[PDB]
Design an enzyme around this catalytic site. Structure first.
Site, short mmCIF file in Angstrom:
data_model
loop_
_atom_site.label_atom_id
_atom_site.label_comp_id
_atom_site.label_asym_id
_atom_site.label_seq_id
_atom_site.Cartn_x
_atom_site.Cartn_y
_atom_site.Cartn_z
N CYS A 1 -13.01 -28.07 5.96
CA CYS A 1 -11.74 -27.38 5.71
C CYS A 1 -10.60 -28.37 5.52
CB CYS A 1 -11.43 -26.42 6.86
SG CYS A 1 -9.91 -25.52 6.66
N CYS B 1 -7.37 -27.60 5.65
CA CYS B 1 -6.12 -27.05 6.18
C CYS B 1 -5.48 -28.00 7.20
CB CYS B 1 -6.34 -25.66 6.78
SG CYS B 1 -6.70 -25.61 8.55
N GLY C 1 -11.78 4.16 -0.72
CA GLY C 1 -12.77 4.95 0.00
C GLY C 1 -14.00 4.18 0.45
N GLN D 1 -11.41 7.30 -6.26
CA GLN D 1 -12.05 7.93 -5.11
C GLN D 1 -13.38 8.53 -5.53
OE1 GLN D 1 -11.22 7.63 -2.05
NE2 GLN D 1 -9.17 6.74 -2.23
N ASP E 1 -2.64 8.34 -2.35
CA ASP E 1 -3.86 9.14 -2.46
C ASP E 1 -4.25 9.82 -1.14
OD1 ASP E 1 -4.65 6.79 -1.20
OD2 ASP E 1 -6.54 6.62 -2.30
N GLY F 1 -0.52 5.71 3.03
CA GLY F 1 -1.34 6.88 3.28
C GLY F 1 -2.51 6.70 4.23
N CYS G 1 -7.09 -28.21 10.75
CA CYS G 1 -8.32 -28.99 10.83
C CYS G 1 -8.10 -30.50 10.64
CB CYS G 1 -9.35 -28.48 9.84
SG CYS G 1 -10.03 -26.86 10.28
N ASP H 1 -7.81 -7.52 -0.01
CA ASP H 1 -6.93 -7.65 1.15
C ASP H 1 -7.71 -7.25 2.39
OD1 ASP H 1 -5.69 -5.03 2.68
OD2 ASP H 1 -6.51 -4.50 0.72
N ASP I 1 0.84 -1.19 0.00
CA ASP I 1 0.00 0.00 0.00
C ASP I 1 0.88 1.25 0.00
OD1 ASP I 1 0.82 0.11 2.70
OD2 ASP I 1 -1.04 -0.82 3.39
N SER I 2 0.27 2.42 -0.13
CA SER I 2 1.04 3.64 -0.30
C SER I 2 1.53 4.18 1.05
CB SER I 2 0.18 4.71 -0.97
OG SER I 2 -0.74 5.25 -0.04
N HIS J 1 -5.57 -21.56 10.05
CA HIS J 1 -6.88 -21.99 9.57
C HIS J 1 -7.65 -20.88 8.85
CE1 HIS J 1 -11.03 -23.36 9.38
NE2 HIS J 1 -11.33 -22.22 9.99
ZN LIG Z 1 -9.00 -25.39 8.75
#
Ligand SMILES: [Zn+2]
Ligand SMILES: [Zn+2]
EC number: 2.4.2.29
Lengths: 370, 370
Positions: A305, A307, A217, A190, A143, A94, A310, A267, A91-92, A336
């Site tokens: 799940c 992962c 924004g 924006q 920005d 800002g 799990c 994100d 990111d910037s 997880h």
């Molecule tokens: Zn999991």
């Protein structure tokens, strides 16, 4: 691999799935990017990759505070520093200045470190330079944040300055050979909740020309309905052939709805932060693992799940680790949660490619909100 | 594999190397056991195993406080709970009562939880029972701690009570079929720094009969010289054909000196605790990674260490992670420190087997203290 190539493999309504190709790797879209401040907190980067992440976000504001951009550069760049060799978006810096630190002008912003009280400066030029020093793959234009709610006048003034800063960011990026040839630059739309301002912003950014376009924004207190309404008219204003990045958005249902409206990239600190705080995401909605009802629940966090957490760990063990304040508790919850997010993005990508994303969205919501 | 088999493969002076065979696995001696309180803090058990640990220690006092021994039993035992399937040694819980909590008698001790203020009880019988509920592989007899310094009278009274408690621990252990057939029981030698009391204690324990013998009441402020002097006469009093366990001892130089005096087993919180606090062990002595001299040091924590941390991570990165308070910093320091400890034990085992441990001890000290 090219510097930057976005290819759309399949569409369904406004939704798209495809790939961004960059020198450091391939990014499957729609993409979710876990957030890093110096490390993902409490995870080795190998674990972050293992969950399915193609790219991570680095917080410029935190990194410039410590250990500092110059030092990171001397140490070999951010990729070397955090042991992650795939693409990184920065990111910037800002937003956090506005939200975390303590003079604004057309030139940029000066602020006092929320840690040491030391004085720091950010401008379109300095933001791009810092991002260069970190060596990131996707650079965000610097920005000016528009608070919510905002009057049309304030929103217009902030949007207009942001567009002037977009041009300066562009020129600063292009003036650095190594950066211009190896990294990509995203512009940020924006204009708050106002359609006409969003259109003028989209027009300004397209005229300047960027590798990708973020819708900025939003997720600033307006609520999901209003966010979706703004996305409804805002995303179609952006060039169709470039990635669309919704910044700071990441509740699973936010993500599904944003993808329905043409967003390719996300994100959010949510899966990591709320992971450390005891909230786990499941297909049946989030749960707080600290709740007494899980003290002797031998089921994994989520029954479907895939992962590693799990596959081995029960809710009962994680319940007691988190309540004991044990680091491992946070490690397991975080692994997880980010893995869950990646599985969500995979199901989104599959459903779009197979022309059944509308049905998936409906099925996901029914079960998640049940 | 048998319930318990200690075999000595090689000797050099008082030093021994061999193996303890138990149902859950083989333990290479001299052994170092990392300490666990609910998790090793900040490590997955797979990582703990990866560093070379054959066995870990579980803190009975902390576990009985949370999540509680009964709950652990209902959840399937401590091995299932912390995801570690190899041998586990549990302490009696007695030391932490003295050091951490807030009425002592011949029957046992009552104390208030240092967390919730709740009331708890420990006795030889209840200690053994809790250790059974946890399902540990090596059980420690419940004893009474002797503070340092101590008068001969106090040391004798405490030693004598501890010996009566050793018999009760033995009988309690034997009365539980599942425990007696699958786990092992260690007695603990007391008697402070007094040779005659140490002899009476050794005699009492041998008469009762245990699977292993710990030298207790040391590393309580007496200093290394006095500890070594006490070990000089104390260890030969213990049965030669059973393991000798020095409790709560773990500076690398303490370990080498104790092995020279016939100690087979060690546990200490040092590598984990001091790991989280910025201290890393190297062959050239400990360093504090937070010190400014490491801010741009690209070398690994130790140049010879074979651990995964040292294969990838520089001192500079770990320096900044620790100073940022990042969990990953603690994770990496801890992994390295316990791996360093295991490499130390391996070098000790190799040198004894090869009849060159005396030379190794001298070389280790010269370099470590240089
Ligand atoms: Zn999991
Ligand atoms: Zn190492």
């Amino acid at each position: 691999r090219p510097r930057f190539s976005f290819s759309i493999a399949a569409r369904e309504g406004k939704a798209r799935t495809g790939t961004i190709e960059m020198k450091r790797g391939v990014i499957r879209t729609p993409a979710f990017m876990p957030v890093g401040t110096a490390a993902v907190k409490a995870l080795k980067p190998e674990t972050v990759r293992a969950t399915g992440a193609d790219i991570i976000l680095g917080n410029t504001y935190h990194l410039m505070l410590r250990p500092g951009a110059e030092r990171i550069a001397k140490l070999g760049g951010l990729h070397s520093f955090m042991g992650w060799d795939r693409p990184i978006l920065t990111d910037s810096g800002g937003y956090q200045v506005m939200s975390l630190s303590s003079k604004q002008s057309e030139e940029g912003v000066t602020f006092k470190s929320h840690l040491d009280g030391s004085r720091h400066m950010l401008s379109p030029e300095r933001s791009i330079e810092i991002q260069h020093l970190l060596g990131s793959d996707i650079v965000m234009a610097f920005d000016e944040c528009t608070p919510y709610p905002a009057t049309p006048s304030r929103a217009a003034s902030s949007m207009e300055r942001s567009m002037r800063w977009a041009k300066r960011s562009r020129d600063a990026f292009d003036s650095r050979k190594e950066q211009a040839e190896n990294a990509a630059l995203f512009g940020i739309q924006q204009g708050s909740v106002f359609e006409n301002l969003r259109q003028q912003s989209a027009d300004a950014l397209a005229e300047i020309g960027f590798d990708g376009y973020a819708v900025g924004g939003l997720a600033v207190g307006e609520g999901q309905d209003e966010m979706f309404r703004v996305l409804d008219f805002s995303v179609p204003m952006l060039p169709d052939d470039k990635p669309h990045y919704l910044m700071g958005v990441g509740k699973p249902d936010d993500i599904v709805g944003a993808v329905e409206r043409g967003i390719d990239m996300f994100d959010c600190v949510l899966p990591t932060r709320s992971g450390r705080n005891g909230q786990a995401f499941t297909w049946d909605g989030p749960i707080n693992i600290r709740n007494a009802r899980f003290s002797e629940d031998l089921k994994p966090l989520d029954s479907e799940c895939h992962c590693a957490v799990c596959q081995k760990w029960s809710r009962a063990c994680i319940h007691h680790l988190i309540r004991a304040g044990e680091i491992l508790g946070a490690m397991l919850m975080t692994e997880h949660n980010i893995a869950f997010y990646q599985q969500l993005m995979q199901k989104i990508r599959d459903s779009i490619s197979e022309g059944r994303f509308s049905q998936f969205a409906q099925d996901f919501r029914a079960r998640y909100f049940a």
